[PDB]
Ligand binder design. Structure first.
Ligand SMILES: *O[C@H]1[C@@H](OC)[C@H](n2cnc3c(=O)[nH]c(N)nc32)O[C@@H]1COP(=O)(O)OP(=O)(O)OP(=O)(O)OC[C@H]1O[C@@H]([n+]2cn(C)c3c(=O)[nH]c(N)nc32)[C@H](O)[C@@H]1O
Lengths: 17, 736
RNA sequence: AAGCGAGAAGAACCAGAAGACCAGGC
RNA sequence: CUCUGCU
RNA sequence: AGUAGUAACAAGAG
């Protein structure tokens, strides 16, 4: 179903705490 | 048990007992490397010296019981002496040969599995295909490539955890494998490594090699994938290219990237053609990626890319009109935009030149764990509606949309150490760098973006910077929908002569203008199979090969330029060069160069072969009349504007008179045979449009003048002009 | 697209007046 | 008489 | 002697 063709960068985020 | 007995014996010895008791496990890392011997400064000499003594090798004490002291010829295989600084004994190479000859054999079915990487090299070289070798002016650029692709799904840390599980299950510690890929690979490896007597340390090292990705900066000319880098010595040479196709399966990501690169090069080259659609079709039917024809990979490779999409449209294949960014597939549902470069100053006081998209537009974002609908204007996020499954996915989608907006507060939200040039000072993609930085930390970005009042929008609760949902307030233009809104459809399109892709209704979906201007490197070597083999090469290769072709055909190029220059300018061999020439300055450069050529033809003598070689490629484009004066002609090379100087010698275009040899970008292009009709005689007459270069100044007609303002001269008058590398010369406005 | 050394959690963590009287606002 | 051939 | 070159080898330590 929902899929990412090509994901660059490290991803995630430190804002969530 | 042997080891506990050895421990008891060690405790029996007083000094060894004191060492064992006093030293801690932390201090072991220090006393483990405790060695009296020093690193040999010239090991080759020491080795040559030690191969002459009787017993240069050292072996474990047990050798004495498992190898006879002497062979049937009486030569002593080993001795009683104990190796210095260890319990190992001395041994001769005879012992090793004896062991390999009549030693205790064992099973080695496990070796291919533990040394999987090396035997994979052997296998894929065995099934590789060798094509013809082509002698070409190879231009190798130094760039980071991968030598060990590793297990992409597993980061270095995951690979280390899997290695600990497989090799040292008891010494794992508190770590637990979570990623499903970790569990599956750990399982298969444990099943394969059953009853493996090989040292666990070697197995761990081989697994680190196999799993952990490793990169290396290497001068390359073809594909940068590991399957091509390991055979780089065999494939790419100084003057030759060996068309080689490594055997075995190829990573789908590498083929996708190489297809994107090939499509970008083909469309960029095909734009400057007189019949772009036919030219694009020919380069598609003549190009091969990784040894596979490019014609038949598009119909089987759904990678989304405006260039790939243009190529698919040219062949009648349904396109998606989508593009990847930040791991999300964007489809432009409505709106249009035009690319234009523009300089920005980041929040960390670094100046960037980013490509801003002018124009209102609306996108649909699809991700692995998120989906969003976005509407943006020039550096302004009009609206964003996210539907992430979890808060982390929502944050990722919001950050990606934020960066994609290219908003000023986005740019100014950069904090800390963010570098947009790698250690080689190659310009990184600013958008990717910003994505990486903000995905590392986004607190500043959300704090500096702004909050918008939100009413009770049904099923569209707002989100706050702290990531907690809110109803009354939210990030400016950001809403979160719980309807799980979730494009893939491939719409048949018609592509016109100029590569403008229009759907049934007729709106321009894709055009070559929105194709990316970056000149990337293919993961798999791309081979072009037309008469001029360098159509789709990088910038430097195109420059060098264009000038080399001019040199080779110089005998006919001269006559054609003298009696029929219009057809010379038409010559397709200059089109890729023009692809490197900026679109804005193409017509003006062509007009200026054509005028210079015509004035050179009219003026008796003043023929300059080197100048014609330098300026001929710029004359391909249709002329554009103008009065502006060019001190240098610009060409795009990996995001840099290389300036070819009209008069004088510059690194981009060099003519060594001592060797009469032309070098382009430091790459030799050949020598120009002596032309008796050249007769420069100081006067050039092929530098300034409408002006003749008398030569050295004489300080009577004027002190000096600039190139641009020099147009003030009406006719006939002589004046001194500062043209070139600080060399003021006397000039005059041509009689006609 | 980037890519040049390592991590994870021992032990355990509130208060009542009530009554009378006086002054006072409404 | 033993040890060493980068200490 | 000779190697070699700004200081050494032409055995050294028990
Ligand atoms: O390695 C390259 C590229 O292939 C060479 C690779 N890549 C692209 N697509 C895939 C893929 O599907 N699968 C794999 N495995 N790899 C893929 O990633 C790299 C791409 O980046 P690069 O070529 O260096 O530059 P560029 O192509 O420009 O990337 P980027 O700058 O991140 O932009 C990507 C797309 O975004 C479009 N775009 C950005 N903005 C802000 C807008 C906009 O505001 N409006 C519109 N209409 N489009 C925008 C860019 O134009 C580009 O299309």
């Amino acid at each position: 179903a929902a899929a990412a063709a090509f994901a660059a960068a490290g991803a995630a985020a430190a804002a969530a705490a | 048990m042997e080891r506990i007995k050895e421990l008891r014996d060690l405790m029996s010895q007083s000094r060894t007992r004191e060492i064992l008791t006093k030293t801690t496990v932390d201090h072991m890392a220090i006393i483990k490397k405790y060695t009296s011997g020093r690193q040999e400064k010239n090991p080759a000499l020491r080795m040559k010296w030690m191969m002459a003594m009787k017993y240069p090798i050292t072996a474990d004490k047990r050798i004495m019981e498992m190898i006879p002291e002497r062979n049937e010829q009486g030569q002593t295989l080993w001795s009683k002496t104990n190796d210095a600084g260890s319990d190992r004994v001395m041994v001769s190479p005879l012992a090793v040969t004896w062991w390999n000859r009549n030693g205790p054999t064992t099973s080695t079915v496990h070796y291919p599995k533990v040394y999987k990487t090396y035997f994979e090299k052997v296998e894929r070289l065995k099934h590789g295909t060798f094509g013809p070798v082509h002698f070409r002016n190879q231009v190798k650029i130094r760039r980071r490539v991968d030598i060990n692709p590793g297990h992409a799904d597993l980061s270095a840390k995951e690979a280390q955890d899997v290695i600990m599980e497989v090799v040292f299950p008891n010494e794992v510690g508190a770590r637990i494998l979570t990623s499903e890929s970790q569990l599956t690979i750990t399982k298969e490896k444990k099943k394969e490594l059953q009853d493996c007597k090989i040292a666990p340390l070697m197995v761990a090292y081989m697994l680190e090699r196999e799993l952990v990705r490793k990169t290396r900066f290497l001068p390359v000319a073809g594909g940068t994938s590991s399957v091509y880098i390991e055979v780089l010595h065999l494939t790419q040479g100084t003057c030759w290219e060996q068309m080689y196709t490594p055997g075995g399966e190829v990573r789908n990501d590498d083929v996708d990237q190489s297809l994107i690169i090939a499509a970008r090069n083909i469309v960029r080259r095909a734009t400057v053609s007189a019949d772009p659609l036919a030219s694009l079709l020919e380069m598609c039917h003549s190009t091969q990626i990784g040894g596979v024809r490019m014609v038949d990979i598009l119909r089987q490779n759904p990678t989304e890319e405006q260039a790939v999409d243009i190529c698919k449209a040219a062949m009648g294949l349904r396109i998606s009109s989508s593009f990847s960014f930040g791991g999300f597939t964007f489809k432009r549902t409505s709106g249009s935009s035009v690319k234009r470069e523009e300089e920005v100053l980041t929040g960390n006081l670094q100046t960037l030149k980013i490509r801003v998209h002018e124009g209102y537009e609306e996108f649909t974002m699809v991700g692995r764990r998120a989906t969003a609908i976005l509407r943006k204007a020039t550096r302004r996020l009009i609206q964003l509606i996210v539907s992430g499954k979890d808060e982390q996915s929502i944050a990722e989608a919001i950050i990606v949309a934020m960066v994609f907006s290219q908003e000023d507060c986005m740019i100014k939200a950069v904090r800390g150490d963010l570098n947009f040039v790698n250690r080689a000072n190659q310009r990184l993609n600013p958008m990717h760098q910003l994505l990486r930085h903000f995905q590392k930390d986004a607190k500043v970005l959300f704090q500096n973006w702004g909050i918008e009042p939100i009413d009770n929008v049904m099923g569209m609760i707002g989100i706050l910077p702290d990531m907690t949902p809110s109803t009354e307030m939210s990030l400016r233009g950001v809403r979160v929908s719980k309807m799980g809104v979730d494009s893939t459809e491939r719409v048949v399109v018609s592509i016109d002569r100029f590569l403008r892709v229009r759907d049934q209704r007729g709106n321009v979906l894709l055009s070559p203008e929105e194709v990316s201007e970056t000149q990337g490197t293919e993961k798999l070597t791309i081979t072009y199979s037309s008469s001029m083999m360098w159509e789709i090469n990088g910038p430097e290769s195109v420059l060098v090969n264009t000038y080399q072709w001019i040199i080779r055909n110089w005998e006919n190029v001269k006559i054609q330029w003298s009696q029929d220059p219009t057809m010379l300018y038409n010559k397709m061999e200059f089109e890729p060069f023009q692809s490197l020439v900026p679109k804005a300055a193409r017509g003006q450069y062509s007009g200026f160069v054509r005028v210079l050529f015509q004035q050179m033809r009219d003026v008796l003598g003043t023929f300059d072969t080197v100048q014609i070689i330098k300026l001929l490629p710029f004359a391909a484009a249709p002329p554009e009349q103008s009065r502006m004066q060019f001190s240098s002609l610009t060409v795009n090379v990996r995001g840099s504007g290389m300036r070819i100087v009209v008069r004088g010698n510059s690194p981009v275009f060099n003519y060594n008179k001592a060797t009469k040899r032309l070098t382009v970008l430091g790459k030799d292009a050949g020598a120009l045979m002596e032309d008796p009709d050249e007769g420069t005689a100081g006067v050039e007459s092929a530098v300034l449009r409408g002006f003749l270069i008398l030569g050295k100044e004489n300080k009577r007609y004027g002190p000096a003048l600039s190139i641009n303002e020099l147009s003030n001269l009406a006719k006939g008058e002589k004046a001194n002009v500062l043209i070139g590398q600080g060399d003021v010369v006397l000039v005059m406005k041509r009689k006609r």
